[PDB]
Amino acid sequence: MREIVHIQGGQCGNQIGAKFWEVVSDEHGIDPTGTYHGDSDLQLERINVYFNEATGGRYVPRAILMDLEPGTMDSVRSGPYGQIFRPDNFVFGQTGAGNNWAKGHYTEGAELIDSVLDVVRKEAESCDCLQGFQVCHSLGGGTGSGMGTLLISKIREEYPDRMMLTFSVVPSPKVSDTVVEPYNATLSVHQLVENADECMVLDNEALYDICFRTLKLTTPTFGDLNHLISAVMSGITCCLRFPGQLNADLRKLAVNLIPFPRLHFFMVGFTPLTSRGSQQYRALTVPELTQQMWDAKNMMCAADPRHGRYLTASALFRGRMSTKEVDEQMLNVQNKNSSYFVEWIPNNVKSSVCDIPPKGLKMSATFIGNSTAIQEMFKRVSEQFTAMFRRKAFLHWYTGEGMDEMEFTEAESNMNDLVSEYQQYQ
Amino acid sequence: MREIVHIQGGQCGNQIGAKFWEVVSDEHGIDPTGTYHGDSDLQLERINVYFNEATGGRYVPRAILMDLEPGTMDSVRSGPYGQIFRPDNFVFGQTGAGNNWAKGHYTEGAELIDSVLDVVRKEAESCDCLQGFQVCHSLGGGTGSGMGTLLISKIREEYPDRMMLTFSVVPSPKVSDTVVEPYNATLSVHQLVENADECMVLDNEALYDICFRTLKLTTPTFGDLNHLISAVMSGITCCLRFPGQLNADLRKLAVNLIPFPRLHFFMVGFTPLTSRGSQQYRALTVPELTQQMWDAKNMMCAADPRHGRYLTASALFRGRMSTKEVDEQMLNVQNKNSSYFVEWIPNNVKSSVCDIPPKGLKMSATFIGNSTAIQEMFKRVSEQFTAMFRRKAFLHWYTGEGMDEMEFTEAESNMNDLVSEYQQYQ
Amino acid sequence: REVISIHIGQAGIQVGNACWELYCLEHGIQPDGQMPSDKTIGGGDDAFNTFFSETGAGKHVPRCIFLDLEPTVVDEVRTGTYRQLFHPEQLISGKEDAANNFARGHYTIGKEIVDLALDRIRKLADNCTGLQGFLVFNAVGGGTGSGLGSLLLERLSVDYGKKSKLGFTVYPSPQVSTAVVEPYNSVLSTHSLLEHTDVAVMLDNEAIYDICRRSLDIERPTYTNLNRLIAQVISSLTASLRFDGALNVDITEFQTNLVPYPRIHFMLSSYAPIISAEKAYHEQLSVAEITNAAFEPASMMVKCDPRHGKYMACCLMYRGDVVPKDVNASVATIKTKRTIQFVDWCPTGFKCGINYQPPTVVPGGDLAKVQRAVCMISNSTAIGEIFSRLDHKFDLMYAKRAFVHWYVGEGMEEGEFSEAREDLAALEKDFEEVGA
Amino acid sequence: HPRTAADFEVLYNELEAWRLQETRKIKEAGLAKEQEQQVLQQLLHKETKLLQTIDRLKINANQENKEARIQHTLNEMSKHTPFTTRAKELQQLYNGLNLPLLTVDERLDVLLHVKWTVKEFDCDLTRELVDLIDREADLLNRGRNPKMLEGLRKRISSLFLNFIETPEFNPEAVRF
């Protein structure tokens, strides 16, 4: 009933959302043809949080694909589970931003938002009770960083009392795939800090390290990273879809993890990520889940928590557990790592338990931490912004596209005071 | 038991009415051979409105076909479902006039209408209790506009107390097909506003844009451009043929939609309209059908319906539904768009339902709106007429046929005054 | 003790189609018109003789005429599941519709079929020997209901005179209405209902929709759902003339008991318990609770909040096992309540009738079988709201003289337009004057 | 030419009296038991024509009353506190916009003055107001007939009036 509408932006957003819908479709039992082919009754109970009933059991996702080039749209259509989406939702400008933030926020955004906003408004009005919006995008590209944040600002001004949870894959310093990454990322966070509500930070460097060590994968294609991010998404959206001994919806997680309205950049993990040569060896229990949870080498970000104190933490478990066990495990972790937690916040950990674990597994958990260690990820982008702004490199491609010379200074100022406001409460 | 006599004039009238007759004959379930094959019983119960048994199942349609060029009747007789019209109903001359309202309305209106009236009188007195006359034609032609208009005047003089539904296609500004379009349009309007009971005006670029967006056809030919109009013409006559929760005949529609006898130029719609690709991804229900009805890019007139107010509107639904939600949707539309509805009438929208959807579907609707935004479809023709008449261009082809400048002055005056009173009611 | 029914217009005919089903089922009559042979339910050798005749060789025929101008509904009935129940001549169908035109339905077309309708009434009433009165079902939102209905009331009051006429008239809902020119027809039919009907039970549509979405829990109702409960109300009203009971109440004192003035006769109708087949057995349904549910403000068949004015005379019909003691206690509590204030000049306000026949049930309905039921017909002073509300939106149209040409083209005049306007003014003024 | 609802009432009542006299004459004729209804229809159509003329006069009177009462509110905005002096200055600017801008040079000068005055606050409305000022300035500088700059001038005047009818911009608008 309470509603989530899924907007995917850019090439990365399109691919991640495609994999995520592939995952959720099988988690609910839906055939890629579109029909329902599940086993248990309890799957059907909340499929209206993600789907619509078209004509005779044709469950279709409530998603909008948004991008400026049709190549990735064609690839998504070709890929599996492509014939599940509504072709009306497919919106694209066919020209291409070309990793030009100014072009994607001022030039082609002004021409394609007029339709993508219409589509998202249509989905919202087809809804009845809106919990909020789900967004997927990047912070290193023209469409993802510019048009994604423009759409986020549009949504916040239109529906001011609906949350947005947005998965932003950010440019890590040493896995960079382009040269204007800080010029895009800083300008995007300029509006992400004051428009969005939960900017769930991800980066591909941590996913690469995880695939190297924990999964012991040798040649990880983007499919597996997209699978991991989809697993995190499903772990977040599970109390909304299955019953549990405790309830923690999106609004509850936000109100618990955001002490101040500018500290909404959460960093996450997932358990148990087991190499398929050790899955047969390890016996999974709640202590094992919490060990791999608080294991720093499993967090999906390049912000090591040993360097920063934790403001808040949440753990969403899935499986018929023992609530005493879960809570005492949280207490044990809090008492062991007694220096990484804020002193003026007692019991920094909030734990929810749902009764239905993901498909196949018998026990799972998702970690969502709001720590001050994340400010390294912003220092490492502010330094690069200053580096390529000191001698005015690559400015004209944005200056002549519509942007002035003061927005960059404003973005640098907001980076500096944001880092200062994490340092203050560290 | 209520009887409609269907007249079709000109090339437009001939082709449109041929499509209409194929659709209606198929829906009542008669094969082109001429026999009956409707499995149900709801179909034989009202064949008498459009069909007459001749001898042994040969249900000949009740229709009159009239123009001046042999090619149109040759094509109609050749085409599918064209082997059922009675040959004696092919009342017809030999010469052809062409784009000349004066030639088709003064010369041939003498030696052809003298027999068209005989055929119409015989066909009307053949049935027991008439309901009205349903005539389809164009305004920018010579053999359909002038000839049809003179027929309209003659039949209004003959039968005073009969409904008249004129399905007239009007010339377009952008869609240039001949140069005498303003002349013919003004001349035809000058008599339609005087005699016609109500004119369900249509055009061509609105239908082309409909086939581009709402159906995504790539090469929309006349064979479907007229199929849409045929569907509308069949859907307007639903109560006279099928049962329902709330029947409503043509007299009822006129009473509910004509505040003053010079305010009877309706713009028409039809729902649902969807592409064959997405005919599987949309939900067929009144909440979506009503939203499709109340749209600007869904009407069949090149008048943006928001460019003014709705003096009145009507909705005709077909299919099992809930007359609670139908009324609630109509009232919701009124309250939401109160700005675009005139003030001195409460409940500007009438809504009547029936229990039989069209064949090949499960639910349908039809929209008939008498709004003041239809003033522009006449303003453009009036301004073109003024520009052309300031130069007497192409005038000799009328003046040497018998028409004078007084006819043009009167047509311009009536056009301007009706447009002015539309502007007043706004 | 026989009563006949005349159905005029789409609404009347449809309500009658959903009512005669209930009647035949309640008296056990098979749909083909004859009672079964072995199966025996109740003793009704004259309990059927009110609404039905008996054509000698076991073939009951209802005392009712359906009549329409648009023959679609009439031949739908003629081909429906009740081909044999009706007489093949009590279903009158003209040729052409009236099309939301009171003038066309009352002057031009109406004056050529009422001559047959009332002749059928004459040679139908000659067959009875204990005639009580008529009851009419019509909607004033259209042509046949308003025009032909008003004409038939005129030419039946002038003919049979003293006999009572229980009207069951559907006014338009305040803001929900299919027809658009309907306020004109509403006022024109009011100026004939006021002076030709002894008791006019009003019925609305938003009120019934609210009832069937709050209590019955059907969020997408329809006319087949409205007419069923309207028929329930009719049957609860007229049960006494067919069934003996502890305290029988017949049609004469509905007038000599609920109509304190010759013109103030306008009934609000209510029925309890409007309940589903799930809440039914989980709720303890006794006299006090069903009466309170009858008297709650949002349980009236007409959308008006009966807290603005005062109640002039209430009549409560009980069906099923109800003792006099607990109904007396319930009405005592109703008087003690602080929400409703009765008019001053009428200290005793209620009249309670009782009958031993439990409420019936139609297989395929939403109202599950219950032990007892209560139906209230109340003369109140909160109908001036309805009349003035319709008056304002009549005036809005009439200022511009919109749609008036459709009327003057058939025979209406602005004279009687203003006459009906001032008639509504006088009626609401009378309500204001009697309230004090 | 009416301006008051009282005068409109007088017109309505005299028209209704005329209707009653006409229909009384038609009735007292006591003839044409079949053309009576046609005469009635023609009389009603006459009534409709006259009512539509009254409606046109009502539209004109409503527009002129609106303009006059806006001017009256501007006057009441003047009848020597500093806020009231600024109000008088803004009234001068509004009258400059109201008067027929027959000269392109004076048009540009008054647009320059109002742009200077407006550009002081700059919260949300000045964006569109400045856009419209620049639109008129450019379409006059490049050279286009001012008779074609009618709706745009109307829009500038409307936005300027809305700007004046604001507390912060005119620090006395709390009055009305």
Ligand SMILES: Nc1nc2c(ncn2[C@@H]2O[C@H](COP(=O)(O)OP(=O)(O)OP(=O)(O)O)[C@@H](O)[C@H]2O)c(=O)[nH]1
């Ligand atoms: N509650 C209820 N109202 C109905 C029902 N059927 C029709 N109506 C009402 O009837 C009105 C339609 O106008 P009517 O007076 O019935 O007109 P008609 O009987 O079709 O005769 P014409 O006016 O000539 O078409 C609608 O506004 C409905 O409110 C019904 O089954 N239940």
Ligand SMILES: Nc1nc2c(ncn2[C@@H]2O[C@H](COP(=O)(O)OP(=O)(O)O)[C@@H](O)[C@H]2O)c(=O)[nH]1
């Ligand atoms: N997780 C994931 N990341 C991807 C994938 N493809 C690209 N990326 C990341 O996205 C970044 C480039 O974003 P880009 O596609 O240019 O954004 P756009 O300009 O809006 O389309 C690179 O740094 C990649 O690391 C994918 O399939 N999965």
Ligand SMILES: Nc1nc2c(ncn2[C@@H]2O[C@H](COP(=O)(O)OP(=O)(O)O)[C@@H](O)[C@H]2O)c(=O)[nH]1
């Ligand atoms: N929609 C539609 N429009 C048509 C058709 N045939 C002609 N027209 C349009 O009708 C207008 C004038 O019709 P015309 O050919 O003069 O009719 P005629 O008098 O019989 O020759 C032209 O602008 C055409 O574009 C048709 O089959 N369908």
Ligand SMILES: [Mg+2]
């Ligand atoms: Mg009717």
